[PDB]
Chains A and B, each alone.
Chain A
């Protein structure tokens, strides 16, 4: 914050072992694909300051979403299709099915 780039210099110690403990991180929803260590400089109206960046690339898991919100849609659309086998004489059954599937 206070010291510009002619007063302080940031660097990672080891340049690849500076950040540890990533492979042990378990997230309930995501999964750490990899992580990057970047060294650069930013320029503001008051000076040029050093900067490091530790960047994670999380990828979201899909099992919960399939089992939770994709399957119900497919089953409701199939429950809508079943109405094609019902004869056209029953107007309270095919209407029932279709309307209910819409609501759902």
Chain B
């Protein structure tokens, strides 16, 4: 009817290459979000997937009409004919909009030129997780976006009061982590092209201790007590205790190769590989101790007699101590 006339009059003499107020003042853009789901945070690639509903609203004095209808509600058929800010996410490895069934976009042009432009995005954002204290580690890693070609003098972003609003936080694929909060931030960065207004949203993730607690910690402590079981077998049966020791070492190295295969190749010492190293040391020390025991039986029997019973008490106490220290320290650290 008459809405066609309005839409035709808005695009008569319209240049979608010039931002609103091209030579007057910067264009103020208010950005809001709606985090559907924060996908799996895989530490191997130092990345994490997020799915949002990015909404941008600005003022365009050229899309200003005067009729009885207050707001024009449109699909993605008129997005490519008006000016649209070139917001890009500065820390996204790969991100893409949705196109099924129709491009997921929305355009609402109010009466006074205020434009709202909303789209659906799935961003594989990047954040270098400092994999210390693993798996007792907490991260807070961001999602940054800014204009691409327009510096601070032309496009200025600004958060709304109630900008970022998470969803249910229950049907998310955050398996090993747990959402605890978020916070928005605005700064200005320097680039070879100019000064840009960079907005950021920091999501706080806290690694829950469950998968690793049952995959490596329990197996390794039970392997340690299996190695302690050798301290009660009689000292004359050599091939039995040597088999205990060597098979324990084999399982220990396999389990370490697995725990380390969990997280990526890092040249520093985490808190989990430290644990498996201490357990390895325990097993190796029980083996070398029984070695010197059997060797000293030929030299001095009373030494070995006082040594089996010395180790039976010395090993579990040292292991309790180690555990206590480690755990308490990391929980306080």
Q: Which residues of A contact B (CB under 8 A)?
A: 20, 26, 28-29, 61-64, 67-68, 72, 75, 79, 82, 85-87, 90, 92-93, 96-97, 100, 104
Contact = CB atoms under 8 A, between A and B. Distances in A.
B291 interface: yes
Contact of B266 (A28, A79, A86): A28
A77 to B, nearest CB: 13
A93 B249 contact: no
A72 B253 contact: yes
Contact of A92 (B46, B128, B239, B288): B239
A96 B295 contact: no
A87 B291 CA distance: 12
B284 interface: yes
A82 B266 contact: no
User: Mostly helix, strand, loop or mixed at chain B's interface?
Assistant: helix
A28 B267 CA distance: 8
B266 A104 contact: no
Contacts of A61: 267
A90 B297 CA distance: 15
B151 to A, nearest CB: 17
A72 B148 CA distance: 51
A92 B243 CA distance: 10
B246 A96 contact: yes
B232 to A, nearest CB: 19
A6 to B, nearest CB: 29
Contacts of A28: 46, 264-267
Interface in B279-317: 284, 288, 291, 294-295, 298
